[PDB]
Amino acid sequence: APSFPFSRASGPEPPAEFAKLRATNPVSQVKLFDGSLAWLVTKHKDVCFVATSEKLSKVRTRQGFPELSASGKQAAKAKPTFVDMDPPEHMHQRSMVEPTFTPEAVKNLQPYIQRTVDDLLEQMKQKGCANGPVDLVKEFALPVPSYIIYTLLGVPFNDLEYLTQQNAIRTNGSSTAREASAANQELLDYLAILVEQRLVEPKDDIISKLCTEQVKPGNIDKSDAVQIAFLLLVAGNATMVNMIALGVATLAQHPDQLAQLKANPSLAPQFVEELCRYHTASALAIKRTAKEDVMIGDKLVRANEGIIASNQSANRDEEVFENPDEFNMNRKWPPQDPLGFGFGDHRCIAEHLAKAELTTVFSTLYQKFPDLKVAVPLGKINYTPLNRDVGIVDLPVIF
Numbered sequence: 001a002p003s004f005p006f007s008r009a010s011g012p013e014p015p016a017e018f019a020k021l022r023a024t025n026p027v028s029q030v031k032l033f034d035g036s037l038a039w040l041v042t043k044h045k046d047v048c049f050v051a052t053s054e055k056l057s058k059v060r061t062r063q064g065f066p067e068l069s070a071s072g073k074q075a076a077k078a079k080p081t082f083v084d085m086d087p088p089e090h091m092h093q094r095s096m097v098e099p100t101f102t103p104e105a106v107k108n109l110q111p112y113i114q115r116t117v118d119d120l121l122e123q124m125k126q127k128g129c130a131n132g133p134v135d136l137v138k139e140f141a142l143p144v145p146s147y148i149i150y151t152l153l154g155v156p157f158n159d160l161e162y163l164t165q166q167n168a169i170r171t172n173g174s175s176t177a178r179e180a181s182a183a184n185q186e187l188l189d190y191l192a193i194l195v196e197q198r199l200v201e202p203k204d205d206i207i208s209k210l211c212t213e214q215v216k217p218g219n220i221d222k223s224d225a226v227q228i229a230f231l232l233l234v235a236g237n238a239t240m241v242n243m244i245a246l247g248v249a250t251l252a253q254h255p256d257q258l259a260q261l262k263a264n265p266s267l268a269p270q271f272v273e274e275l276c277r278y279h280t281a282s283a284l285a286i287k288r289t290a291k292e293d294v295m296i297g298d299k300l301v302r303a304n305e306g307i308i309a310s311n312q313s314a315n316r317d318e319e320v321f322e323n324p325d326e327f328n329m330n331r332k333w334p335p336q337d338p339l340g341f342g343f344g345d346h347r348c349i350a351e352h353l354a355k356a357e358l359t360t361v362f363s364t365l366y367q368k369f370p371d372l373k374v375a376v377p378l379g380k381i382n383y384t385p386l387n388r389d390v391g392i393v394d395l396p397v398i399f
């Protein structure tokens with residue numbers, strides 16, 4: 001059994017193994033870091049099955065859950081939030097915060113998202129490009145998602161820059177285990193204080209809703225409001241940062257796609273849909289443990305055996321998406337949907353918010369900077385290490 005995670009074929013490409021497994025052995029076993037075996041599903045149809053089956057469990061404490069690293073095993077002991085819950089507890093907790101993430105709530109959030117994006121682009125314009133290229137990640141890609149999520153949670157405006165920097169520390173590769181954990185408690189400590197405030201004097205934010213509707217009524221504890229708040233902040237922020245950078249790098253790679261977008265910004269939604277399929281920035285999140293014997297294809301997964309469904313592989317499934325390795329914003333979409341944000345009950349709570357943020361970024365970026373270009377040769381872009389999810393560490397740009 002080959003060890004998993006697999007390494008990406010190159011900077012922007014998915015692991016080479018998936019294409020082979022899809023063709024010759026769709027449901028197979030891989031070897032995890034601790035020597036244990038898990039089943040890997042690679043076909044779109046099977047990933048959808050794994051994400052919806054009632055015979056499969058998301059509980060991380062269950063012996064058999066496929067942890068991918070030693071640290072992941074230590075994180076499994078902490079008190080679970082809805083992300084690690086099965087029905088009926090899952091929707092019970094997820095429904096407490098989901099109202100802010102609905103399609104309509106996000107539609108009413110558009111003027112704000114647009115304003116935030118405009119302001120950061122304006123700052124980057126004042127910052128200058130005179131003494132050399134700017135890092136698009138620290139100056140734009142990082143602040144955009146952070147300020148928004150922080151503001152939705154309830155963080156004061158003047159605290160955004162410092163808090164955005166700290167959250168970046170947790171996921172920074174050049175960060176010691178020391179620095180990462182001190183950043184975690186810093187944020188955790190701040191959220192707990194914010195919870196104490198909103199209980200006294202609530203506001204128009206996610207924390208005040210939790211305090212008013214769940215904490216006061218005795219539905220959940222104070223520390224529960226803190227854990228949910230923290231989950232919402234750390235869950236997909238790093239992924240959003242990467243998606244923005246990946247979008248810019250992808251447009252530099254295909255001048256034709258860029259030309260179209262510049263000519264018609266209204267194509268941003270189409271660009272965003274293809275980007276989330278093509279670049280599956282979160283490919284190791286759909287993991288389950290069989291609660292009972294289940295047959296997937298010609299395999300039979302026994303009770304208590306772990307499963308990892310690759311949505312990245314599913315997004316490149318020739319059987320579903322024609323010319324899956326070609327990046328085409330003008331692609332004709334099949335009835336089956338891309339799995340960039342998951343599938344089933346655990347499908348990303350922030351899917352609509354994420355797409356709104358990305359659509360605003362890509363329908364504005366090139367209108368502000370029509371001559372924006374990656375200053376380093378494409379082959380030299382500093383992508384994340386091959387053994388992990390696709391991303392870009394820094395992106396020098398001129399405009």
Ligand code: HEM
Nearest residue numbers: 083232235236239240282285341342343346347348350354
């Ligand atoms: C474009 C960026 C994003 C991508 C590609 C992404 C992707 C994913 C994926 C693949 C899953 C699905 C796992 C499953 O099906 O079980 C997921 C779950 C989740 N995401 Fe994201 N996400 C993004 C942005 C966000 C943001 C901004 C937030 C924060 C508000 C967030 C919060 C969550 C949470 C809380 C879950 C767990 C939902 C549940 O288990 O019910 N994600 N995300």
